[PDB]
Amino acid sequence: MREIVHIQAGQCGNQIGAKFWEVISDEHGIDPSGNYVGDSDLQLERISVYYNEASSHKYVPRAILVDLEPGTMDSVRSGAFGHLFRPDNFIFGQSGAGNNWAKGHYTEGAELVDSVLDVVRKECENCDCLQGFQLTHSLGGGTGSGMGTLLISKVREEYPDRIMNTFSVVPSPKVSDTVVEPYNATLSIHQLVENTDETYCIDNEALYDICFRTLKLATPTYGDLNHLVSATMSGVTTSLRFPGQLNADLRKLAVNMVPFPRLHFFMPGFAPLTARGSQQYRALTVPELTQQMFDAKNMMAACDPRHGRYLTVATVFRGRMSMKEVDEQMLAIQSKNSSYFVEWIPNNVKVAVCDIPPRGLKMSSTFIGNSTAIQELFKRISEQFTAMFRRKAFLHWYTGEGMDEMEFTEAESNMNDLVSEYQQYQDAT
Amino acid sequence: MREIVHIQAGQCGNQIGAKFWEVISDEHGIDPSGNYVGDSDLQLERISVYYNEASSHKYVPRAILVDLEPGTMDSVRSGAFGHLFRPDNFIFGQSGAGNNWAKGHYTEGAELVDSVLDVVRKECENCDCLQGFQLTHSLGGGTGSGMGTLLISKVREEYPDRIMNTFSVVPSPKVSDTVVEPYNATLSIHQLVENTDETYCIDNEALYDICFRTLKLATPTYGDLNHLVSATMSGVTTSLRFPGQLNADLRKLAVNMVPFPRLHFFMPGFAPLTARGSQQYRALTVPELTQQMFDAKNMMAACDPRHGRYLTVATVFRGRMSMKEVDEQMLAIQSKNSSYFVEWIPNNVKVAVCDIPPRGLKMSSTFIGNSTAIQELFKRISEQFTAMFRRKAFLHWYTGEGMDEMEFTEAESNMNDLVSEYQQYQDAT
Amino acid sequence: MRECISIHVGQAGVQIGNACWELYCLEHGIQPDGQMPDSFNTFFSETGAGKHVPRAVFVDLEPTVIDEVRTGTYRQLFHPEQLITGKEDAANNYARGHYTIGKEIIDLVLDRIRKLADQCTGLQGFLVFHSFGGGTGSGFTSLLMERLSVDYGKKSKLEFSIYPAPQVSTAVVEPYNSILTTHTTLEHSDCAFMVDNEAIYDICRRNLDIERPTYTNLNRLIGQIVSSITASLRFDGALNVDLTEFQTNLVPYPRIHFPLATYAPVISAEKAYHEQLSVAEITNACFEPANQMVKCDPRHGKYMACCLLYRGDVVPKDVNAAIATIKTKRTIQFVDWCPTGFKVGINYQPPTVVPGGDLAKVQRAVCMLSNTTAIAEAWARLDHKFDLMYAKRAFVHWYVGEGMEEGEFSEAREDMAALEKDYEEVGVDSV
Amino acid sequence: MRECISIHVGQAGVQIGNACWELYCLEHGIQPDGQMPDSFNTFFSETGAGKHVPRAVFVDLEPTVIDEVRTGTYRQLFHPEQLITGKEDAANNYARGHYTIGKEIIDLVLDRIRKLADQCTGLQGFLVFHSFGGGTGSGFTSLLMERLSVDYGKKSKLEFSIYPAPQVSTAVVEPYNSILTTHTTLEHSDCAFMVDNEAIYDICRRNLDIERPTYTNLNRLIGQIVSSITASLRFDGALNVDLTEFQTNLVPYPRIHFPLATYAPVISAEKAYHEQLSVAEITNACFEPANQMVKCDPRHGKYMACCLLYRGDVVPKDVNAAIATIKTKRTIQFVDWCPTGFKVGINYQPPTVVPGGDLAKVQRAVCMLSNTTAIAEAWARLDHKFDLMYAKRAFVHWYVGEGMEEGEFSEAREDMAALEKDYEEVGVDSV
Ligand SMILES: Nc1nc2c(ncn2[C@@H]2O[C@H](COP(=O)(O)CP(=O)(O)OP(=O)(O)O)[C@@H](O)[C@H]2O)c(=O)[nH]1
Ligand SMILES: Nc1nc2c(ncn2[C@@H]2O[C@H](COP(=O)(O)CP(=O)(O)OP(=O)(O)O)[C@@H](O)[C@H]2O)c(=O)[nH]1
Ligand SMILES: Nc1nc2c(ncn2[C@@H]2O[C@H](COP(=O)(O)OP(=O)(O)OP(=O)(O)O)[C@@H](O)[C@H]2O)c(=O)[nH]1
Ligand SMILES: Nc1nc2c(ncn2[C@@H]2O[C@H](COP(=O)(O)OP(=O)(O)OP(=O)(O)O)[C@@H](O)[C@H]2O)c(=O)[nH]1
């Protein structure tokens, strides 16, 4: 049974984690005390991908919660699933880095990381065949991008074969809540290219765009944006835990998507997203939801896939499907916008199905696009960074900590080589 | 039936002995009056290792309580088990040596120790096949370090074949409650090497470290540290009193641990140690608890075992085990930190199981490591003692009694030869 | 005698045998508990207790596929010592099937064969079942067919491989892990059938009049072909078509062992009454390009040597009569240097019905195995498809980092292009 | 006649005999009270009242082990004047069992043998049971079997010692107390079997499908071998395999008396139905390196003289026919200087089931006793592992202070290395 220890750096990465295990404990039928109350035994036959056992019929999630500031630990302790986690796993410092990167990586985060890897090694020891690590954090912040990349580069030193996932929340140019967001973002990606095996650049703009346009909610009060990123987080590992007609592991997406070892930056997408009570009854019927899935509106990263041709696309399905109706529909998408895919990867749409849907639907299907229009994301940040780095504003809060000044010109050139690398295949053949 | 008379010297040894018989009178189901109220007869068939019989169904423990300080007799005489002990066995002087070693060994202790050997020979006569003598005392103090080593060198004169145990609470540099602690410690060890054949150098720092980190108690109020050293004191002799699948006596341990007759200084360790209400119900599981048992946090001597390779290791299990899972795990531990063991002792981890756990668990397992990192315990004291011996401070309280000044320079060389002997195998092969 | 084991590997390989062994229990009255309430010994080594054990080795490196078989129905039929199972899925990586993980579990699969090949007095041959679509089906089988050819030299070994479809696709590295496996199956294999996966949809669309077929409506049709190929070893008729005096009616040269299967009839239940399914239409249906099992047109190429394997209530009078219309009075041109025609494998046993309700019962059936040169058009749509990807060196770093030398793709493409030149070489006789 | 007594030394000696004599009560219908509700007289000198005293003497210097047998079940079966019991364990010490404490309780054990060796008209031999893991199992047994061969010269004496594993270990001084044992068991012993304890975990995990076997799951698998070795003395067939016959049918020299036991079949109750357990499968399974009862690979070494001891529903037709496969057309190479093959020990009685629920019932069995030269790699560990400890003079002062002279280890290693040179000497014939 392949195993995935699940770290949660940052505050937002802890805000989406309490709605991540809320999905899975419903998906495996697990009470908030930690027992099993599920009906179908096909759930219980493989829960060891995400769980452990107690000295009873009681299961405990393989989670490592890391945040430099408490209170968010007091939220998940007093939430709906407070008695679910292992209380030894709750690693939390004292101060909380105030949106600083040098603090939280060099100064403050180094005093906490050795308390973390004594719990990573404990969870790596109780696993038979470890599959990989997935950590959910927020770029742009202080402790999701300073502690997070320190935690990755210490883990990938010790486990250079296990897969690495990162559900990073990149900053958006419109919905920005931090003046030093273009500093902490462009510092993380230098230490995120070389160590993570496949990330997931979820933006927070398009999640506000889905809940207005597609989902058509009134007020998206953070119990949805930090929930919708969990529905596509269970959608990737829904083939590890359930029997399918054709299933794909985390190694399978990490070998069908990347054509070069630098190009692991994915824009995920989930469908069906109905209205609350309108489109799920009045209009939408659910075969062939790929035309919803490939839409520019129904993305997570705030980039336009019409502005840049795809490289590889993974569409993990979940419902009780029919493999002709999956694949013949998948060919019609590849023949419709035939200029929107790269030439030298023929028949790039990797598919995978399962047999158990999410509870409350009949069919569902995520989508993990490895586009080259993710260069429009990094072209925004490298615009905002190069504006602020001219005046060298906000540098005494980083150079005051143990971080040099040539580190920024080194880290900006590492990003601008990545955008030079992603543009290398948009126009060539 | 092998027999062990047990001599609670000192006051701290009397403080941990009042919680030592409280374990055993629960472990055999013996009421505080002294009767038997146990259910299973397998615990009754051999109680004569630790007990006698009166002229009824009423047992009286083979215990000798020695302290120059009086009044702490009246604690255990008026405690929960005051009616259990034999009142003739309560031996106590009048004054109470005030943290002096020369007083308590030469002057004060010699006027009392002949009353003890008229009781330890009274208890040696009612035993059929005597196994050894346990004695629990506090090193660095006044009574247990000066009356105790006078008592051992008188016992080992009369019984040169019986084994000897010594649960000496050593001093620690961080938690020191005595200004003449590095004087009474280094005077005792010279008279502790040549006579006892296995000690158990527990510490009072790591006991304070366990109740905050591992056990996570709020206030360690001395009813825990005197209890936690009682669990690993019953755990050594839990094979003498219970039928095991593979059992080990005290002679079996001292023939498996020391490779040379001077290397009997063992750092014990006990596991499982849960939280107070969390891990004992939710998180911890109890096969393969050797990962807890080998950790640096779950030790008794405040020393880092990673700083020095183990010589020999005895792990006495207790629970209803499965001898493949005991031994396959034991090979995986020896192959993991394969640099942390001595080369010229191959396959050194001695196993021993039993069939009856402590009342309130399912499995339990002590661990008795004969490390070479116990030289760090003696390099602190021989640093502090050599500092005070330059100025020759606090010396008229020892040279005032019948103790020479060259005795300290002789006792330091007898300690520094032991640290030279223990360092002789850390680097050689 | 005449026993014939069948090893399975891949997500396709176990999923076929989950439904292929569903069929053989119907063709011998074997219960799902393995207890028959004559001669089945070519597929079942029975025990003295009245049970029956199928002679198959279900392997996969990923545990989530065999555990469907190991827990649902038919969980008492097999033997738990033979359902070999790894831990890592060897995700679409030929080097992870041929060098990294498959190297570890080869010595358990190969050990279980000698615990089954020593219970065989007469061993006809091996029946592998994999897909060329990456992973263990191409990576672990290449480490297995290379392994069996050392220990079992003079022994036939069939191969029911699934070819990657031209337009329908599942993997992204489908063209990478198919050039790498044909260097194995060109030498070590023998009569490697290569059915396609798209072409059975175009049989389940028009010939079979169902819509949206799953992989259970598609693996039934691939189980019926392996039934009537081995219908000579366990029934009667005018056969003499055992797997060594049949495969020398197939290959003209040691490199042209790539026939295509074709089954007929596949007529649904509602259309079963509106057609007299007799031997004239039954034979003429096998040569329709809309009725082959590979996406290729045999009207383009030329047949070398078919092998018509009948079964059911036929008589060799009109078999030899309906052949002569197809032989002479048609425009399906044979190659010149063999005018003898093709084999004929008449057997008495009619085919059965899997109770899932796919195709109603008939009285006649064919599995014609034509060694046409229309397989060269099934590789020019892979030679171009692989070289389009290898020109930019995409995905090579997921193979060269796993223990595979980078020059192997320049060897496998060099080999399989010389095969396509060789396959088109024997297409002409006169100048 | 044909009586055979079994002595038991050590913690391993009684815990086997607690479950060895559990099996003989099922193999003769004897109740736990000893009261049978033919010929059991090879193991049960019965009394006139209807009881049956088993002819065994349980020796241990520590009372905590025999008091389990003396108080639990089977507490009325044994004779209370024969469970000899000391007071001090003397454990993990050769000298404390051979010089200090074992010298005291020898005169109670050896007197109790002559109170049982004077009820045997025909005494076949002694069956000791100990471990080489220190304490009385090597210290007291070296004193006992030296004392027995003085009073009983012309009498065979088997030895079912538990040789210590290379990796899985319990005692720290475990290599010291085995080099000091082979100086005894070279001279005084006869056909000293040496099973291991790690090799049963590699049997009770894959061949027998249970997880985490206790010491009650290896002391039943060691009980069946002493059953089927002495199954010739008390049953029928085509046997002629009494203990004096197969003794010099096995050893080629007076120094090569170290065979290995191997049992087959050991298949669990779940896969007891999915495999026909016939005599060709039973012998071919009995030669696997993953099925021997010691940690050694017999493919590395060469067999000198095997000895198969079948029992149950076999016939000597196909026993002798299935042998010739293993005899000639295999690569398990025999030694050159004896081409006669090996003994065949066919018995009629099938093996039984101990009701603890470990392995289901069968109809056939074999306890092959190969005198291979692959035991020279079992002593290749302890010739090095003890020499690695003795170079630093570790743990010697717990022996030189007990009565053992310090030059004994320099004598025991010098003898045991010359034995290993002698074992590798008879492995070659031609220059
Ligand atoms: N997906 C979600 N993102 C959020 C949410 N709340 C805030 N944020 C996002 O995450 C960012 C918050 O920054 P962080 O989580 O990294 C807080 P930081 O680690 O920098 O310091 P601390 O406050 O001490 O934890 C914010 O800019 C938003 O981009 C949320 O509820 N859900
Ligand atoms: N393990 C424990 N050690 C204790 C405890 N209380 C005190 N002490 C330890 O024992 C030391 C003092 O106890 P002593 O018996 O040595 C005092 P002394 O020998 O002079 O006898 P009295 O004056 O009659 O008390 C102190 O430095 C501590 O290291 C306790 O509760 N547990
Ligand atoms: N014809 C047919 N092909 C199938 C079927 N199921 C799966 N396949 C093919 O099998 C391939 C799946 O991979 P496998 O052959 O099992 O090898 P793999 O990559 O190791 O897959 P896993 O073992 O699951 O990791 C896909 O390319 C499919 O085209 C089926 O039911 N019928
Ligand atoms: N195979 C097997 N070996 C056992 C069993 N019980 C104990 N042993 C072996 O016994 C060895 C230890 O020697 P002991 O049998 O205890 O000999 P001893 O020291 O004289 O016995 P005591 O003096 O009572 O401690 C270990 O290495 C074990 O391998 C058992 O049930 N099965």
PDB file of C-alpha atoms in Angstrom, chain A residues 240-313:
ATOM      1  CA  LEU A 240      -4.590   5.235  -5.252  1.00  0.00           C
ATOM      2  CA  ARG A 241      -7.454   4.401  -2.906  1.00  0.00           C
ATOM      3  CA  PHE A 242     -10.153   3.010  -5.175  1.00  0.00           C
ATOM      4  CA  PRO A 243     -10.299   0.293  -7.835  1.00  0.00           C
ATOM      5  CA  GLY A 244     -10.751   1.627 -11.329  1.00  0.00           C
ATOM      6  CA  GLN A 245     -11.137   0.387 -14.860  1.00  0.00           C
ATOM      7  CA  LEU A 246      -7.963   2.333 -15.644  1.00  0.00           C
ATOM      8  CA  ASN A 247      -6.089   3.995 -12.796  1.00  0.00           C
ATOM      9  CA  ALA A 248      -3.059   6.234 -12.448  1.00  0.00           C
ATOM     10  CA  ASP A 249      -0.756   6.841  -9.490  1.00  0.00           C
ATOM     11  CA  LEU A 250       1.155   9.960  -8.480  1.00  0.00           C
ATOM     12  CA  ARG A 251       4.128   8.596 -10.392  1.00  0.00           C
ATOM     13  CA  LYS A 252       1.887   8.227 -13.452  1.00  0.00           C
ATOM     14  CA  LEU A 253       0.926  11.886 -13.530  1.00  0.00           C
ATOM     15  CA  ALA A 254       4.530  12.782 -12.750  1.00  0.00           C
ATOM     16  CA  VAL A 255       5.691  10.798 -15.792  1.00  0.00           C
ATOM     17  CA  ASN A 256       2.930  11.546 -18.305  1.00  0.00           C
ATOM     18  CA  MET A 257       3.005  15.319 -17.850  1.00  0.00           C
ATOM     19  CA  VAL A 258       6.592  16.582 -17.643  1.00  0.00           C
ATOM     20  CA  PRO A 259       8.625  16.442 -20.878  1.00  0.00           C
ATOM     21  CA  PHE A 260      11.686  18.072 -19.279  1.00  0.00           C
ATOM     22  CA  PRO A 261      12.763  18.100 -15.613  1.00  0.00           C
ATOM     23  CA  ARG A 262      12.097  21.850 -15.241  1.00  0.00           C
ATOM     24  CA  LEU A 263       8.513  21.977 -16.525  1.00  0.00           C
ATOM     25  CA  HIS A 264       6.553  20.832 -13.455  1.00  0.00           C
ATOM     26  CA  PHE A 265       4.048  23.644 -12.978  1.00  0.00           C
ATOM     27  CA  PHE A 266       0.433  22.602 -13.349  1.00  0.00           C
ATOM     28  CA  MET A 267      -2.816  24.506 -13.563  1.00  0.00           C
ATOM     29  CA  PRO A 268      -5.453  22.134 -12.168  1.00  0.00           C
ATOM     30  CA  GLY A 269      -9.150  22.163 -12.919  1.00  0.00           C
ATOM     31  CA  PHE A 270     -12.224  20.454 -11.494  1.00  0.00           C
ATOM     32  CA  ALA A 271     -15.634  19.748 -13.018  1.00  0.00           C
ATOM     33  CA  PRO A 272     -18.674  19.560 -12.652  1.00  0.00           C
ATOM     34  CA  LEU A 273     -19.228  22.885 -10.920  1.00  0.00           C
ATOM     35  CA  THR A 274     -22.961  23.540 -11.044  1.00  0.00           C
ATOM     36  CA  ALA A 275     -24.941  26.285  -9.401  1.00  0.00           C
ATOM     37  CA  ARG A 276     -26.130  25.804  -5.835  1.00  0.00           C
ATOM     38  CA  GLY A 277     -29.626  24.723  -6.817  1.00  0.00           C
ATOM     39  CA  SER A 278     -30.143  26.048 -10.316  1.00  0.00           C
ATOM     40  CA  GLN A 279     -27.880  24.417 -12.891  1.00  0.00           C
ATOM     41  CA  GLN A 280     -27.683  21.079 -11.076  1.00  0.00           C
ATOM     42  CA  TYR A 281     -31.427  20.675 -11.682  1.00  0.00           C
ATOM     43  CA  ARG A 282     -32.583  22.971 -14.499  1.00  0.00           C
ATOM     44  CA  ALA A 283     -29.817  22.567 -17.058  1.00  0.00           C
ATOM     45  CA  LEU A 284     -26.752  20.414 -16.483  1.00  0.00           C
ATOM     46  CA  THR A 285     -26.625  16.715 -17.280  1.00  0.00           C
ATOM     47  CA  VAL A 286     -23.340  14.952 -16.738  1.00  0.00           C
ATOM     48  CA  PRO A 287     -21.825  12.959 -19.530  1.00  0.00           C
ATOM     49  CA  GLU A 288     -19.026  14.712 -21.495  1.00  0.00           C
ATOM     50  CA  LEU A 289     -18.167  17.401 -18.954  1.00  0.00           C
ATOM     51  CA  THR A 290     -14.771  17.851 -20.620  1.00  0.00           C
ATOM     52  CA  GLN A 291     -16.090  20.916 -22.451  1.00  0.00           C
ATOM     53  CA  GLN A 292     -16.644  22.365 -18.999  1.00  0.00           C
ATOM     54  CA  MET A 293     -13.208  21.124 -17.956  1.00  0.00           C
ATOM     55  CA  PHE A 294     -11.194  22.690 -20.780  1.00  0.00           C
ATOM     56  CA  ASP A 295     -12.853  26.096 -20.379  1.00  0.00           C
ATOM     57  CA  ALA A 296     -10.790  29.150 -19.547  1.00  0.00           C
ATOM     58  CA  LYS A 297     -13.282  30.076 -16.823  1.00  0.00           C
ATOM     59  CA  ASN A 298     -13.088  26.716 -15.035  1.00  0.00           C
ATOM     60  CA  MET A 299      -9.409  26.835 -14.135  1.00  0.00           C
ATOM     61  CA  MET A 300      -7.525  27.401 -10.907  1.00  0.00           C
ATOM     62  CA  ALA A 301      -4.525  29.397 -12.075  1.00  0.00           C
ATOM     63  CA  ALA A 302      -5.465  32.881 -13.268  1.00  0.00           C
ATOM     64  CA  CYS A 303      -4.019  32.428 -16.739  1.00  0.00           C
ATOM     65  CA  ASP A 304      -5.614  32.108 -20.149  1.00  0.00           C
ATOM     66  CA  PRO A 305      -4.913  28.736 -21.805  1.00  0.00           C
ATOM     67  CA  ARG A 306      -5.970  30.276 -25.115  1.00  0.00           C
ATOM     68  CA  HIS A 307      -2.906  32.527 -24.819  1.00  0.00           C
ATOM     69  CA  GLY A 308      -0.493  29.586 -24.829  1.00  0.00           C
ATOM     70  CA  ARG A 309      -0.511  26.066 -26.209  1.00  0.00           C
ATOM     71  CA  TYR A 310      -0.809  23.051 -23.923  1.00  0.00           C
ATOM     72  CA  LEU A 311       2.030  20.589 -23.476  1.00  0.00           C
ATOM     73  CA  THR A 312       0.413  17.638 -21.674  1.00  0.00           C
ATOM     74  CA  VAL A 313      -2.985  17.246 -20.029  1.00  0.00           C
TER      75      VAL A 313
END
